[PDB]
Each structure stands twice: as structure tokens, then as C-alpha cells.
């Protein structure tokens, strides 16, 4: 038997271009700062970042 | 930036023992009939089944 269960998930946007991102450079210092790959390679953030997918 | 999004998913139980199942034998004929592996191997359903995980 199957039923529906409601749950949540995280959805990310690039803090710079405001676009939806799944692969993202995540700031290890800011609380809530992510960049798309293009913005990472264009306007680089002055904190250590990690690339998450 | 991250925010929460609400969404749903399917959760399955064994129609026989009523336990939660993730690996399950699914009836190809009934609309809503699943068996856990133990119940599949114990009280077999008189329809073709497929094993889903
Ligand atoms: Cl990159
Ligand atoms: Cl089996
Ligand atoms: Zn961007
Ligand atoms: Zn930062
Ligand atoms: Zn069962
Ligand atoms: Zn059946």
C-alpha cells in the first residue's frame, strides 16, 4: 500500500545573479551565501568556499 | 542562499503485515498491493509481481 507523506528540502539560489543553483560554491564563513559557477569564476567572494553538488 | 520548499513522496507498507517497506514486491495487477520480502516468500499473491527498491 502507498500513501503520500509531506516533507521539505533545501532549494538554493546564487546570491549574485539570483538564479536557481544545484551545483554551487558555498561560503564556509557567511551563514547563507552561495554562488553559481559562472558568478564564482567572475566575481569571487573574499572567503573560503566549497563546491557542493 | 537557501530556503525550504515543501514537497511530497510515497511511503509504502506491506499489505499483509502492515509494516513499513522500502524494498517491496509490487503487484502489477492490483492498484495498491505491496508485500515485504518475508511476506512475499511466505504468503504469495496470485498475481504477477515486480520487486522494487
Ligand atoms: Cl568551477
Ligand atoms: Cl525475494
Ligand atoms: Zn550566479
Ligand atoms: Zn562569505
Ligand atoms: Zn509483510
Ligand atoms: Zn494483486
Swiss-Prot record, chains A, B:
It is found in: Cytoplasm; Nucleus; Chromosome. Zn(2+) 4 binds at residues 14, 17, 36, 39. Zn(2+) 5 binds at residues 27, 30, 45, 47. The modification N6-acetyllysine is found at residues 43, 48, 51. Acetylated on Lys at up to 17 positions by intermolecular autocatalysis. Sumoylated; sumoylation in the transcriptional repression domain (CRD1) mediates transcriptional repression. Desumoylated by SENP3 through the removal of SUMO2 and SUMO3. The CRD1 domain (cell cycle regulatory domain 1) mediates transcriptional repression of a subset of p300 responsive genes; it can be de-repressed by CDKN1A/p21WAF1 at least at some promoters. It contains sumoylation and acetylation sites and the same lysine residues may be targeted for the respective modifications. It is proposed that deacetylation by SIRT1 allows sumoylation leading to suppressed activity. Functions as a histone acetyltransferase and regulates transcription via chromatin remodeling. Acetylates all four core histones in nucleosomes. Histone acetylation gives an epigenetic tag for transcriptional activation. Mediates acetylation of histone H3 at 'Lys-122' (H3K122ac), a modification that localizes at the surface of the histone octamer and stimulates transcription, possibly by promoting nucleosome instability. Mediates acetylation of histone H3 at 'Lys-18' and 'Lys-27' (H3K18ac and H3K27ac, respectively). (Microbial infection) In case of HIV-1 infection, it is recruited by the viral protein Tat. Regulates Tat's transactivating activity and may help inducing chromatin remodeling of proviral genes. Binds to and may be involved in the transforming capacity of the adenovirus E1A protein. It is linked to Defects in EP300 may play a role in epithelial cancer. Chromosomal aberrations involving EP300 may be a cause of acute myeloid leukemias. Translocation t(8;22)(p11;q13) with KAT6A. Interacts with HIF1A; the interaction is stimulated in response to hypoxia and inhibited by CITED2. Probably part of a complex with HIF1A and CREBBP. Interacts (via N-terminus) with TFAP2A (via N-terminus); the interaction requires CITED2. Interacts (via CH1 domain) with CITED2 (via C-terminus). Interacts with CITED1 (unphosphorylated form preferentially and via C-terminus). Interacts with ESR1; the interaction is estrogen-dependent and enhanced by CITED1. Interacts with HIPK2. This is Histone acetyltransferase p300. It comes from Homo sapiens (Human). The lineage of its organism: Eukaryota, Metazoa, Chordata, Craniata, Vertebrata. The gene is EP300. The chain holds residues 1663 to 1709 of 2414 of the full protein.
Amino acid at each position: 500500500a502507498r500513501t503520500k507523506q509531506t516533507q521539505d528540502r533545501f532549494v538554493y539560489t546564487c546570491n549574485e545573479c539570483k538564479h536557481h543553483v544545484e551545483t554551487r560554491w558555498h561560503c564556509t564563513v557567511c551563514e547563507d551565501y552561495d554562488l553559481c559557477i559562472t558568478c564564482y569564476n567572475t566575481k569571487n567572494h573574499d572567503h573560503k568556499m566549497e563546491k557542493l553538488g
